[PDB]
Fold Aromatic prenyltransferase.
Amino acid sequence: EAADVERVYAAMEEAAGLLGVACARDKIYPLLSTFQDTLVEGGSVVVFSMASGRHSTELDFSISVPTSHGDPYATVVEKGLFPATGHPVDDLLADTQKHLPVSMFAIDGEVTGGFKKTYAFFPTDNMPGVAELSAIPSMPPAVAENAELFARYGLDKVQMTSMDYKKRQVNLYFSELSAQTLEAESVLALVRELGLHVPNELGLKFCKRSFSVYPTLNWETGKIDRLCFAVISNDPTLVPSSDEGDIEKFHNYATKAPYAYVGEKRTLVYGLTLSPKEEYYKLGAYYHITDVQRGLLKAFD
Ligand SMILES: O=S(=O)(O)CCCNC(CO)(CO)CO
């Protein structure tokens, strides 16, 4: 409703404020208004995320959208909020719902740049494997071409995918991760084969605690762009960095980010991203949570 739109935008401004980032109202309000029906507390998931290093001047936001509301990408294009890219990514969200059971969607953007991404969630008890995903016509060929590698490291079931319309990239969020997969030996071998930044002791300890792992792929080459390990927790001190600046800044955000569910501790999702040239950190502070997050905390925190 109107009040919800205002409440969520005010929260977004508060979160961005902690990072010294200013929101572009003209790029955000129309989007929130368009999806105002999803902003009611309960059943909704909203996350405001910060990052380290060269990615620190931006605040990302992600808002869940029920499938009943319809393809959110189709919505933003038809309403004139975003231009079709003319590339296969334009058809991926639709093709995913066509070929696989999608249980929920999500829209995502940057507070200074606006809408730029969608997510497709799959049922936890009926998740697709790399084979099913590689069959989708508009999926990057890189998914099928890295199938042998994924299998070798136990990256099988995918809980959700995300599509970045501006960068023309796809993330595969692997779940039901085996202990073996997250053991140091496995992680090091994987990063080695992908030619990504080698994590140290602190980084590997963080990887072992992960509940989700996601590589980023593209349509131009079969090479994986980067790999991210995610950790969910109520502990505000987990950023896997030795930098005093990061330690202080992430803890500050973790203990001051806005949240509507007072009476419970803030739900936090940390990320450790490994690219060919470096490693960086992310922290998503949930403004809205559901029982999915409560269950994850009991299982992983
Ligand atoms: O490989 S990179 O680090 O250049 C691209 C990833 C940056 N993405 C954010 C959003 O998902 C935004 O700045 C993450 O922090």
Summary: The two ends are 34 Å apart (CA to CA).
